[PDB]
Amino acid sequence: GAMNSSNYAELFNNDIKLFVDDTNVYRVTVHKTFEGNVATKAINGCIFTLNPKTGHLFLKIIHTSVWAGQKRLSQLAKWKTAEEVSALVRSLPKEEQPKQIIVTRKAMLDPLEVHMLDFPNIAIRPTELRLPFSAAMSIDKLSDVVMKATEPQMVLFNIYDDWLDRISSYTAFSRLTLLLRALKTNEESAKMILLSDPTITIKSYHLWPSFTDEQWITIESQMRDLILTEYGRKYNV
Amino acid sequence: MNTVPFTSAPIEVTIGIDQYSFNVKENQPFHGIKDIPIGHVHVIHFQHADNSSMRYGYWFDCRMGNFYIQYDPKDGLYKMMEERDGAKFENIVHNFKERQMMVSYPKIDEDDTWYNLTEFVQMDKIRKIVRKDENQFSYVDSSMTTVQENELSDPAHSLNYTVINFKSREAIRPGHEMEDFLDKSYYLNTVMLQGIFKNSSNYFGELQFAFLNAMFFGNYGSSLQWHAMIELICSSATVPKHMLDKLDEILYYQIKTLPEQYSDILLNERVWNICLYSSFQKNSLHNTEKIMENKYPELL
Ligand SMILES: COC[C@H](C)NC(=O)C1=NN(C)C(=O)CC1
């Protein structure tokens, strides 16, 4: 059934699984027309498909041409997500295909179930976790490849950089979700924290800076403070 | 006008015949039901006074044979049987009528209710849903499960309704996933009507039979099938105009006949609200929508 705080370690067992987040698939800017009406303009989006054990991110870039001439785009976007995830699974060798796909939003369940009818043994699950994957477009290198795309494209990343050489996948996932939660609650501050010290750099083949173990403890503490702050600044506490 | 005699009534029982019912006391001198209209299927059904558990009964068509009821004290139920000796049967019936030991099928001349509930129901199709080929009549009860229910356990005692599943490869064309799931017309028209049922009369017949088994026996599986067949039509954007008009009449008389107090067990809130207010056919079921709103406005 649903994934929650009670079965959290299941994410890091040896059964292949993927999270799918669709919150950046259909993206628009809202603007005024010369006549004073409101219209939207689509911008490039992305499906966020993540193996939480290995860090492998399958970033399917959704180019704005996919929406041309289509109606009910918020609904279509869920079915397009499900089509692309199904296509990804079929493209993988059998021994790499997931045993479970966990969707971050319950509205993805029926679209994905219908597109995966050919895979009756792959479980499609919701989650009660409130995961911050919408903030993926606050990672500069991910936002860059999405906005620069001129056609549909799939880009592969490891969202943990080389962390698994030193920490476990439970701890790497916890670090990732803290970074993304911070970026979601106050992007400017979060990014200040991450890049303040110009002697720590981002390797060309990485997404995050090359912090030492001790520096990560400091960074992680600053992100907790930020989230607590904003939680205060928000509710006045 | 045909007759279903009873050998006797050894246990106290409520007896139904179609939409009518009456109480018989233990060892009361009751010997059956006369003046049964020719031209329709019928159902004769039972609820024992001492164990209201297991409503059970028999679908039959008097044109197909001479049928009677006899209690079996070993299996503990009223059984339908066929009498092949036509002269024995006519002599039994004539004697019971002479002694006025039979209730009369109490049809009002103005009243088309039973026709309107069984318009498309055929005994030959009932016998394919309820498989027991050695008898011309068909037994149903409250507990019998459907083939679909068994897949999610005795196959000889199952209701073999046509399986309908909106998230199945049968329902969903590869490459038309969104289209077929949000508009079920290809599943309705090509798969079910053209492919399985052959025509809308057979579809409506099964829909009507499933309703009647739900109502008369509280058969949960039958109730599920009735709603699934309604939902498949309502969730199709392209339905022949004659089918929508006939569906409106079918459902109108089903809702009219339902006991006012059983609306919580025999009506599915989700299906009816979806069908009447959100579906492609939300504006095509005027008679049904009107009686539903005036009789069961709570459900909505
Ligand atoms: C899940 O199957 C059993 C479930 C509790 N409903 C029933 O048993 C009933 N269902 N219906 C439709 C009736 O008319 C009698 C009670």
Side-chain angles (χ1 to χ4, degrees), chain B residues 218 220 265-266:
Chain B
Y220 180 69
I265 43 153
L266 295 172

Side-chain angles (χ1 to χ4, degrees), chain B residues 212-238:
Chain B
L212 292 166
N213 288 326
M215 181 172 58
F216 289 132
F217 309 112
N219 187 267
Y220 180 69
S222 292
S223 182
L224 289 183
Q225 181 70 12
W226 179 53
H227 284 88
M229 299 189 74
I230 296 170
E231 187 165 4
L232 174 54
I233 293 174
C234 292
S235 300
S236 299
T238 304

